Design a protein around this ligand. Structure first.
Ligand SMILES: CN(C)C1CN(c2nc3c(F)c(-c4cc(O)cc5ccccc45)c(Cl)cc3c3c2ncn3[C@H]2[C@H]3CN[C@@H]2C3)C1
Ligand SMILES: Nc1nc2c(ncn2[C@@H]2O[C@H](COP(=O)(O)OP(=O)(O)O)[C@@H](O)[C@H]2O)c(=O)[nH]1
Ligand SMILES: [Mg+2]
Length: 170
């Protein structure tokens, strides 16, 4: 049938996972969306001429490591790894998310994009170069976004779909 892509948005609390997801799905900026709610949403889009379905898992809740969690995360075909440019701790957390993704996928090569969100803010602690260097070390794209203004949002998601397509051709 129509190609579906299962995308999972990961990262620390407060980085803008929900705001990014809601911009893609519902085309507006939502402030203070319940931080605890993990949910998924589908949207039909055309990317490079392909009509496809994006199923997006917007992660939330406590740090916990069950068999059920591992099984659910393994359903993801590609991962947005999100930090906020004003939050160094959120950047430092990326390594952990990448390692957990590789663990559950049982692969060194999982489609992923590094996303630096909140690029509309003046209060930046993570420079563009630090993030580009990390992404280069992982062999993945880096995209700066603002869920507030919608800068980079489509690019982030569509780049992840392109990473999935490249993986399928290997
Ligand atoms: C050592 N802690 C202080 C760090 C904070 N962090 C978190 N790791 C999480 C994690 F690895 C998984 C995790 C477990 C697992 O079974 C398999 C996974 C596969 C891929 C990615 C994460 C997985 C899940 Cl489900 C949640 C994690 C998490 C952490 N801090 C907050 N959380 C929650 C909020 C913000 N991110 C999520 C929503 C490590
Ligand atoms: N200025 C700004 N605020 C943002 C942006 N994305 C999210 N926020 C705000 O940051 C907070 C956390 O966002 P949220 O989407 O709940 O993050 P999540 O915990 O990762 O789901 C909220 O107050 C949002 O309004 C962004 O790109 N720019
Ligand atoms: Mg959220």
């Amino acid at each position: 049938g129509m190609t579906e892509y299962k995308l999972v948005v990961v990262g620390a609390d407060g980085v803008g996972k929900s705001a990014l997801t809601i911009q893609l799905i519902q085309n507006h900026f939502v402030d203070e969306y319940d931080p605890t709610i993990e949910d998924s949403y589908r949207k039909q889009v055309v990317i490079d001429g392909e009509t496809c379905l994006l199923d997006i898992l917007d992660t939330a809740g406590q740090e916990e490591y069950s068999a059920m969690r591992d099984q659910y995360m393994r359903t993801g075909e590609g991962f947005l790894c999100v930090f906020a440019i004003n939050n160094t701790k959120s950047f430092e957390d990326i390594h952990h998310y990448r390692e957990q993704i590789k663990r559950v996928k049982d692969s060194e090569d999982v489609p992923m994009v590094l996303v630096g969100n909140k690029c509309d803010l003046p209060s930046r602690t993570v420079d563009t170069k630090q993030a580009q260097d990390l992404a280069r070390s992982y062999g993945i794209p880096f995209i700066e976004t603002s869920a507030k203004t919608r800068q980079g949002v489509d690019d982030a998601f569509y780049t992840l779909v392109r990473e999935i397509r490249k993986h399928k051709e290997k």
